[PDB]
Design a protein around this ligand. Structure first.
Ligand SMILES: c1ccc2cc(-c3nnc(N4CCNCC4)cc3-c3ccncc3)ccc2c1
Ligand SMILES: Fc1ccc(-c2n[nH]cc2-c2ccncc2)cc1
Ligand SMILES: Fc1ccc(-c2n[nH]cc2-c2ccncc2)cc1
Ligand SMILES: [Zn+2]
Length: 335
C-alpha cells in the first residue's frame, strides 16, 4: 500500500498516493473532477479523475462499476486507458472514493476546430485515429453512443484518444426517432458529422431541438426510401415520416464543394440514412481517403468483453463491493 496525503482544491477534497505530485485542477463536469499531476514513478504528467458521488444510488453505483470495467478493458492507442486506479480506503467498509489515472491530454477536438481551420491532411489523420479506435471498441461489442468533438482528446502531437466510451448535433437519426434497436453504426454517423465539421469549419446539423435536428438531416440525405420505410416498425414514426413532405438526397459534391473528392465519397458512405447501409469502422479504414495511414496489420481488435452484468439487478452494496474487487485486482500496464 502506498502512502497517501490529503489536500483540498476547488472545494473538492483529494487524497492520493504520494507518487502523484503537483495536483492542479484541469476541468470538472457532471462525471467528476480532473486534476493534472506529475507522476514521480514514471515521470509522466497525468490526469487524475475523482469520481463524484460514486455510490449515491444504484444508478450511480452501477455506472461506477461499468466505467471501471470498461476502462480496465480498453488497451488501445486511440482509446483512453487506465494507468492506475486507487482508493484511500483500506477496507471495503470505509470504501467510498474512486480515483482514475490516465495520460494527461492537452485539448479536445472542439478546442482545435474552433481555434483554427484544418487542412485536408490533418482531417485524414484525425479521422483515421477515431476510426482506428472505433474499430477496436466495436470489435468488443461496445457502442460509444455519444461521439462528438468534445469527447476526443488530442495533444500537441495531434495524437487522438476516444473518451467516455449539444450532443444532439452528432446523434444518428434513428436515435432522434427513438429506434429501440440501433447498432454500432450510430457511431459511424457521428464520425461523419465530425469529419464534415473539420472540413467545412461549420456544424453540419445545428438543430435547435430533436424535431429540427431531424429536419436538417433529411434536408441533406433525403427522406427515407421505400426500402428503409419497410424497416420501420413503430407505427407512429412510420406515420410521421410518411406524412412529411418528400425531400431528395442532395449531391454532397455540391454541398462540400472544394473538399477532397475522396473525403466527399467517404462522407456519402457514412451519412447514409439507412443504418444497415452505412460503412463500418473496419471498412472505412480501408477507404482510399486514408491510403497514407491505413495499415491492415496495425489496426487491432479487442479481447472479448463480458457485458452480462448490465442486465443484473443488485443492491448498491453489491455494486459497491464489485467495484472494490475491480479496484483491488487492477494490474498496471507494462511501463
Ligand atoms: C482515467 C481514465 C479516464 C480519464 C478521463 C479524463 C477526462 N475526462 N473527460 C474529459 N473531458 C474532455 C472535455 N469534454 C468531455 C470531458 C477530459 C479528460 C482528460 C483526460 C486526459 N487529460 C486531460 C483530460 C480524465 C482523467 C481520466 C483518468
Ligand atoms: F427518418 C428516418 C431516419 C432514420 C431511419 C433509420 N435509419 N436506420 C434505421 C432506421 C430506423 C428508424 C426507426 N425504426 C427503424 C429503423 C429511419 C427513418
Ligand atoms: F418521434 C416522433 C413521434 C411522433 C411524431 C409525430 N407524429 N405525428 C405528428 C408528429 C409530430 C410530433 C412533434 N412535432 C411535430 C410533429 C413525431 C416524432
Ligand atoms: Zn446522478
Amino acid at each position: 500500500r502506498p502512502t497517501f496525503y490529503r489536500q483540498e482544491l476547488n472545494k473538492t477534497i483529494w487524497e492520493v498516493p504520494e507518487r502523484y505530485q503537483n495536483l492542479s485542477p484541469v476541468g470538472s463536469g457532471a462525471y467528476g473532477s480532473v486534476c493534472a499531476a506529475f507522476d514521480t514513478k514514471t515521470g509522466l504528467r497525468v490526469a487524475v479523475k475523482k469520481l463524484s458521488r460514486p455510490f449515491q444510488s444504484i444508478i450511480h453505483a452501477k455506472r461506477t462499476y461499468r466505467e471501471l470495467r470498461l476502462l480496465k478493458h480498453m488497451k488501445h492507442e486511440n482509446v483512453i486507458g487506465l494507468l492506475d486506479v486507487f482508493t484511500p480506503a483500506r477496507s471495503l467498509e470505509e470504501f467510498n472514493d474512486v480515483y482514475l489515472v490516465t495520460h494527461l491530454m492537452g485539448a479536445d477536438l472542439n478546442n482545435i476546430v474552433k481555434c483554427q481551420k484544418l487542412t485536408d491532411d490533418h482531417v485524414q489523420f484525425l479521422i483515421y485515429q477515431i476510426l482506428r479506435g472505433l474499430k477496436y471498441i466495436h470489435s468488443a461489442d461496445i457502442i460509444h453512443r455519444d461521439l462528438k468533438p468534445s469527447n476526443l482528446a488530442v495533444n500537441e502531437d495531434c495524437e487522438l484518444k476516444i473518451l467516455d466510451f449539444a450532443t444532439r448535433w452528432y446523434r444518428a437519426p434513428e436515435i432522434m426517432l427513438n429506434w429501440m434497436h440501433y447498432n454500432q453504426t450510430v457511431d459511424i454517423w457521428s464520425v461523419g458529422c465530425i469529419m464534415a465539421e473539420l472540413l467545412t469549419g461549420r456544424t453540419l446539423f445545428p438543430g435547435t431541438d430533436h424535431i429540427d435536428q431531424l429536419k436538417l438531416i433529411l434536408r441533406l440525405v433525403g427522406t427515407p426510401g421505400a426500402e428503409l420505410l419497410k424497416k420501420i416498425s413503430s407505427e407512429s414514426a412510420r406515420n410521421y415520416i410518411q406524412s412529411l413532405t418528400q425531400m431528395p438526397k442532395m449531391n454532397f459534391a455540391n454541398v462540400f464543394i472544394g473538399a477532397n473528392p475522396l473525403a466527399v465519397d467517404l462522407l456519402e458512405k457514412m451519412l447514409v440514412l439507412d443504418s444497415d447501409k452505412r460503412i463500418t469502422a473496419a471498412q472505412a479504414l480501408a477507404h482510399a481517403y486514408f491510403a497514407q495511414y491505413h495499415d491492415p496489420d496495425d489496426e487491432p481488435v479487442a479481447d472479448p468483453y463480458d457485458q452480462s452484468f448490465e442486465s443484473r439487478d443488485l443492491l448498491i452494496d453489491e455494486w459497491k463491493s464489485l467495484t472494490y474487487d475491480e479496484v483491488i485486482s487492477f494490474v498496471p500496464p507494462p511501463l
